[PDB]
Amino acid sequence: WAESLIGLHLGKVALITGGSAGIGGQIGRLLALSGARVMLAARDRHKLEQMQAMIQSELAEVGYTDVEDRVHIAPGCDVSSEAQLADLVERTLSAFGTVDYLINNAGIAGVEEMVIDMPVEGWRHTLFANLISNYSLMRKLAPLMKKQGSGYILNVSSYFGGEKDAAIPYPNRADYAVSKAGQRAMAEVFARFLGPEIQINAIAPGPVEGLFARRARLILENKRLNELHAALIAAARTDERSMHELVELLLPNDVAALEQNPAAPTALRELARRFRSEGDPAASSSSALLNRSIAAKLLARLHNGGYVLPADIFANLPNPPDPFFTRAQIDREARKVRDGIMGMLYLQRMPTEFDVAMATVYYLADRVVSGETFHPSGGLRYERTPTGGELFGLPSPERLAELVGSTVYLIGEHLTEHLNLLARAYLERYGARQVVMIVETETGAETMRRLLHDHVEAGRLMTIVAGDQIEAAIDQAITRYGRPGPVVCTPFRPLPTVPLVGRKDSDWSTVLSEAEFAELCEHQLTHHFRVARWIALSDGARLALVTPETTATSTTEQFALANFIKTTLHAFTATIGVESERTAQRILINQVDLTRRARAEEPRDPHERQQELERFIEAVLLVTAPLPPEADTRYAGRIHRGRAITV
């Protein structure tokens, strides 16, 4: 195999992030064997030095001379830091000149929690490390590639980031899933701009042989958290005691005592009985309700949900003795995970890191593929109906009738026409009691109050100025106006109006900057994430995530950025649509797309634009009309969550 690689990439320069181990180290190894000069970037110096020494030794074995000139390293490189990415490019260009191949391989697992347990800064950090870093390196290296007349950008995505026309849920990993979907969406939308000189593609393996036990423990700890939280929420619906008083029932941390307490609500007694029946008697989770870590996550969910509880409520919690989960429990769960994964591999074999790197070095030699995602995955398939669609009608008159007297929250600022039309449809057609218009600025509040002057005067339209504090604004709306039914989350900001590539012989100074790409993610992805994270614990809410608007006259740049957002947000919507099922609130969350892939499909005249606006109202109604608990079966429930419809 080493002989057959000779000369394949001779004369090429490759930059590989996360190049000290895994797929990254193997790509670096095989590209060096194929003749390329490689720069391997990573955090840990020692692991990076070992990888460089191993590759250099192998090059010398197969006949290469001056092996030190062929494999360089960039240690202490944290791809989540913009300054460190600029230093990495400086070092790489100083060593080898123009980079031919940018291998965006570095990646972190992320927060590994459900959205409702995910710190906002943790989500942002995953986007910086896994996604924004890819645009940042492309922005720095593409001008030089264009100048020389050739280049290749390869983003190492994941099958769990989804596929071109089918999003995939990845519960407890939404930050990771979104970053992976974005790496693929970058290849899908930038190909038109990077061509003809530069190819851009992604690879999307799933499991790669180089884990199930670590995953198993997280699953068991998460299950305990979810079960406890859902039981407290369900008990609170029909019990007059405060959440503080209900949480007091947990303070002895005694499963049998809670089960046997006739004053405990039915939901909590049944939960304790389930812990005893399902539990391994040797596990302390069979006899203790929770530990310090789970108690902290539970308290955070309750505080986020608006419950009043002292910060030290679990300070005296008895600490359960190890093991909280036995080896038998962890092993049983690890086997379930393993079997679930193996069952998705139609070649019945997980590809190795070497297999993925080998497939990639041959992808890098092709010159006719661009804007695609390759799947060197072992025939990995997760069967699922695609989450998208454009032919829909309205929900039934009986579901629409349930909107009479409802409290609607609309979030937005730049889409004034959509916000005005939607507030009016809810108040004038569907008899909603009130609409709370949560804007970003006082200028936004003035604009919306002017548009909805009649409803403001009648006390039917109220405004809230969120600024950069959307969660606190939602809490103010809850205090002032009551909990919402429909929640329609539109972006506060429009998309930027800037070029996405520069002219061949230009400095690219006006091209979308690395900081502007981070801002695009903040306003168009993080905005929705924060709202969904908060609204997920608001009992009775039905949330619609709305993407930016494309029109028949949008620029090609506008279409590219809007479709990048649309695809990337689908991963978030699909993931949180599944996570919703693990909560007692089990809210509806779906996406309504004001972005189309094709300019030709857009309305072209006043009549067609009117039809589009009516479809927007209908799409929002379809995902915001309530779904009766009786109709909310496992079958129907999944159809009404995590979907995306195109207006």
Among 388, 494, 496, 499, binds a copy of itself (CB under 8 A): 388
Angle at 549 between CA 547 and CA 553, to 5 degrees: 155
Residue 276 near a copy of itself by CB under 8 A = no
- Stretch of 9-17, 88-96, 189-197, 529-537 lying at the interface with a copy of itself (CB under 8 A): 189-197
- Please give the size of the binding site for a copy of itself, defined by CB under 8 A: 79
Give Cα separations from 494 to 48, 515, 561, 603 (angstroms): 42, 16, 11, 20
Residue 535 near a copy of itself by CB under 8 A = no
**Shortest Cβ 153–a copy of itself spacing (Å):** 13
Residues 393-432 that bind a copy of itself (CB under 8 A): 393-397
**Chain centre distance of CA 233:** 26
The first and second tokens of residue 16, run together, are 């590989």
Query: Which of the 8 DSSP states describes residue 163?
Result: B
Nearer to a copy of itself, 408 or 622 (CB): 622
Residue 541, annotated ligand binder?
no
**Shortest Cβ 341–a copy of itself spacing (Å):** 15
**Chain centre distance of CA 408:** 26
Task: Spell out a b/e string for 531-568, using b for 16 or more CB atoms within 10 Å of the CB, else e.
Answer: bbbbbbbbeebbbbbbbbbbbeebeebbbbbbbbbbbb
* 199, β-bridge pairs: 152
Provide long-range contacts, Cβ within 8 A and 24+ apart, for 266-272. Answer: 266/235, 267/231, 267/232, 267/234, 267/235, 268/231, 268/232, 268/235, 270/231, 271/227, 271/228, 271/231
Among 386, 494, 496, 499, binds a copy of itself (CB under 8 A): 386
Per residue, the 3-state secondary structure of 15-34, as one string, reads EEECCCCHHHHHHHHHHHHC
**Shortest Cβ 241–a copy of itself spacing (Å):** 34
Instruction: Give the contact letters, 143-182, x = binds to a copy of itself (CB under 8 A), - = no.
Output: --------------------xxxx----------------
**Shortest Cβ 612–a copy of itself spacing (Å):** 7
Straight-line distance from the first to the last Cα atom of the chain, in angstroms, rounded to the nearest whole number: 51
Residue 349, annotated ligand binder?
no
The first and second tokens of residue 532, run together, are 């969904």
Residue 66, annotated ligand binder?
no
Residue 10 near a copy of itself by CB under 8 A = no
Residues 61-100 that bind a copy of itself (CB under 8 A): none
Among 346, 443, 446, 469, binds a copy of itself (CB under 8 A): 346
Among 96, 152, 160, 374, binds a copy of itself (CB under 8 A): 374
Radius of gyration of the chain (CA): 27
CA-CA distance, 315 to 300, in Å (whole number)?
14
Instruction: Give the contact letters, 602-641, x = binds to a copy of itself (CB under 8 A), - = no.
Output: xxxx-xx--xx---------xx-------x-xxxx-xxx-
Residues 432-461 that bind a copy of itself (CB under 8 A): none
Among 63, 311, 368, 553, binds a copy of itself (CB under 8 A): 368
Among 121, 367, 479, 509, binds a copy of itself (CB under 8 A): 367
Whether the CB-CB separation of 188 and 362 falls below 8 Å is answered with no
Binding residues for Mg(2+): 236, 239, 550, 580, 585, 602, 612
Binding residues for NADP(+): 18, 20-21, 23, 43-44, 47, 78-79, 105, 176, 180, 208
